[PDB]
Amino acid sequence: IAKINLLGGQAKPGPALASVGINMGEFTKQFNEKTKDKQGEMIPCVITAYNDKSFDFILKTTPVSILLKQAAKLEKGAKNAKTIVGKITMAKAKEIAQYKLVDLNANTVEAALKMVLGTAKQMGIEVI
Amino acid sequence: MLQPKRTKYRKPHNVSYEGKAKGNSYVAFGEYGLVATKGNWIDARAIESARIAISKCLGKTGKMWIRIFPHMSKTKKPLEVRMGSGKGNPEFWVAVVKQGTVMFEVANIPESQMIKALTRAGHKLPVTWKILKREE
Amino acid sequence: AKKDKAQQVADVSHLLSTSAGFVIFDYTSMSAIEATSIRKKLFKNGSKIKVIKNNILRRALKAGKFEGIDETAIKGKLAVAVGVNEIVETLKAVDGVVKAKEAMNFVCGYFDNRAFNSADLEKIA
Amino acid sequence: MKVRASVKPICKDCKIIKRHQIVRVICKTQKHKQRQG
RNA sequence: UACUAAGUGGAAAAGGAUGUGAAAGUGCUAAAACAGCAAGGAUGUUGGCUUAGAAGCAGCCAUCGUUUAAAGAGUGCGUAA
Ligand SMILES: [Mg+2]
Ligand SMILES: [Mg+2]
Ligand SMILES: [Mg+2]
Ligand SMILES: [Zn+2]
Structure with a gap:
């Protein structure tokens, strides 16, 4: 393998x-x-x-958090977790979730929703 | 090197370290403390070694207090000199540590780092040290 | 604690009382990726795979006034595969997967107020 | 083998034993054998 | 009546150690304890800057979330990675 x-x-x-x-x-x-x-x-x-x-x-699908950058309209996320630069709504989050549902091993779609928040928190993007 | 800025008398009588603990007996600024179990004279050089050790093994947010201070000086006659012709000149400053005086205290970082920090500070000092905590 | 254990035994006993089909499996040599694959392939709320304690399963079985399952839960590694309504399709699915596996054992289970044997599990699919 | 007045484990695999009334430290890594504890 | 296994007794310090005895508390355990043995020990992904490269195990931006019994941006080794 x-x-x-x-x-x-x-x-x-x-x-x-x-x-x-x-x-x-x-x-x-x-x-x-x-x-x-x-x-x-x-x-x-x-x-x-x-x-x-x-x-x-x-x-296999291209790796995550590059569409987060695309949707946030910024090239690179903040270099400090506390500093918040990008903002992402639920509609862009759900489009990303249904796109990346193929590679994910989650049973439900809300699980995929909060994966986007989880990687967005790593990127520092507020979930609005 | 902690050193008094000025002193009234250059050559004072030495101060005994035999006895119990007068002041600096209980942790009152931090909450972990390095207590002594053997009175001895420790100089400002040992303080700086211990203080530098604590600071190097500290973190980015830990805070420390040094209780003892080398108030009293000590002299030393030059080598190859026969007895007489007055007292020698002051050479080094020593803090008087009695059995039971808390020398260093630490706070504001987890317990394991504080226990380790006090250990490295006490290995730099001649007195037999012991860890104590602050009463609630 | 003891109260949590009492709550746990009570609810699993209730679940096995209101259920209709059960089968026991072992946990020898299958991957967690494979475990998530089984969860998604079932996708039915009636079908449920779960790791149960051997002790807790016997005591819940004692509270379930059933008999004969003791030979299954003795000196063995136990899974629970509870099925609601239809259980034949769940057994068919798990049988296809163990065939897709490398190696697997299979221990007798309980369904329709009757117990079965190993060969009876082979034909129950 | 390292002869020291004080012997303490270096890794988590180092194990202290007492052989022939002397405390030693044995481990998978042979750089960490200590004696004269 | 107990203790010591060192000829300690019958000379020594900072420091180190599953030597042994006594005591006082606290956690689990025949709804199974601890060790060992047999199995699994995950997905997005190898996250992203960053670094020739790191992507379970370089510094980071931090130190994610689901499935699930369990799983760590990993426990090390180790791989240019
Ligand atoms: Mg002797
Ligand atoms: Mg010992
Ligand atoms: Mg003892
Ligand atoms: Zn070692």
Whole structure:
């Protein structure tokens, strides 16, 4: 099992795969085939590395707290937790939650709502 | 180096450290304190070592008080000098610590750091130290 | 304390009294990711997987005036899989998952005021 | 082995024992063997 | 009648130690205690600045939240990371 970082538009390189026995050249087409709907975005892949050779792979969403920055209309969050700069309402929080519901292992959507508050607190953005 | 700014008399008689505790007997500024169990003469050099030790092992918000102060001076005749021809010149300042005087106290930081801080302060002093707390 | 334990035994006894299906499982070699996956695949309020104490389960069973389950809860690792209304689909789901697992045991459970055996659990799916 | 007048555990794995009426400290790391406690 | 296992007795300090005896309190325990053994020990994610890089284990912005029995921005080792 390997959690490898591969660009959606550029995933053909990577020597580490060759150490396990993965058929790199056949699987490059599979890597590129199902990521064209999210071209440009960086997408890591989880690989069920084993000796079966039929390596099933699963894509993965870009990491959180960059859409928080996008919605807060600021490039980088505050360098002090006490200092509050960005403000985010519940509507932007819920759009982020339904977007990131795919990668999250939470059963409900309110759990996903308060994940956004939790990472926003880390970013320092007031939850209004 | 704690040192009195001026003194009326340069060469006073030494002050005994034998006896119980006159003042500075109970923690009254902080709430943990370093009590002594053996009266002895400790000089301003040992205070500075202990104070610097406490400050280095303190944090960003801890606060400390130094109770004892080296009021009394002591002299020392120069080497290779035969007895006579008056008393020697003052050399170092010593604070008189009796059995039971609280020398250092600390507060405003968790208990473990305070216990550790008092330990490193007491390892710098000749007296046999002990930890005490402030009455509620 | 003792009062909290009394409250706990009472409510689990009430829950198993008002329930309709139960099956016991072990906790040998399955991941927490897999545990969250089982919770989401069930997704039914009637179906519930829970870690119960072995002692508390026997005492709640004693208060439930049932019999014969003692052999299940002896010198073993116990899970509880309570099902409300329909329990066949829950058993089918858990059976498919243990087949998807690497290794797993399976201990007799209780349903419809009757008890079953290990092979009876194999056919109850 | 380090011979010191005072012996105390260095890591959490260091364990104090008393062998042949002498207290020593043994541990996985051999840099931390102490004696003459 | 107790104590010492050191020939202490029959010389010594700062400091160190699961030596042993006595006492006074407090926590859990046959609704199972402690140690050990057998299992799991999570998700967003590898959060984000930051650093060539750190993303469970460089300094940080701090020191998140759900599922859940439990899980830590981790316990270390360790990986350029
Ligand atoms: Mg002798
Ligand atoms: Mg001892
Ligand atoms: Mg004793
Ligand atoms: Zn060690």
